[PDB]
């Protein structure tokens, strides 16, 4: 395992709290996990890949219920293919 | 207003259906909505930008109640120009 995608969920958990979402806090987690180059970089589109993952992971169990601290790998492994094969990375 | 903010918010919510969350429908929407260069492109910047606003507009209001069929347009334009900055585009 990692804890590096638990990390985003975190986050994703962190701007849920409000009673809405913190567009600033994303911003700054995504510009934290990244570094903020300012251009396209590899790292920022598989961090939008990870901070998506992180995110439809959270919708996806949210209509089951709790979300885990940890996505299923099978899942987490099938968004991945799809999506690098998508944006190429 | 527009409705190509919606469309991306019906895609959402199709993705929503299901009980949990359908990655192929997630990539096919993407895909769709974009075209699928396969690699970088300011509007696969701009669509990811685009679903992740939609995502998080879901987010936002899931935690509200319903979700509307049209975003805030003070929220969209913060958003829009706190990932802007962000990535760049």
Redesign the interface.
Known sequence: GSSRLPSLINGIMS??QG???N??N??NV??QF?T?????N?N??NL?MD??LS??????????GTVPSYPSPS?MS??SQ??RR???Y
Chains 1, 2 share one sequence.
Do not use: E, K, P
Not at 36 to 40: D, P, Q, S, V
């Open positions: 701007s849920m009673g809405g979402f567009y600033q994303f911003g995504l510009s990244a903020g180059t300012g251009t396209c590899s920022d589109l939008l901070a998506l995110a439809l992971h959270t919708l996806s169990y949210q209509g089951m899942a099938a968004y799809s999506v998508c944006f190429g």
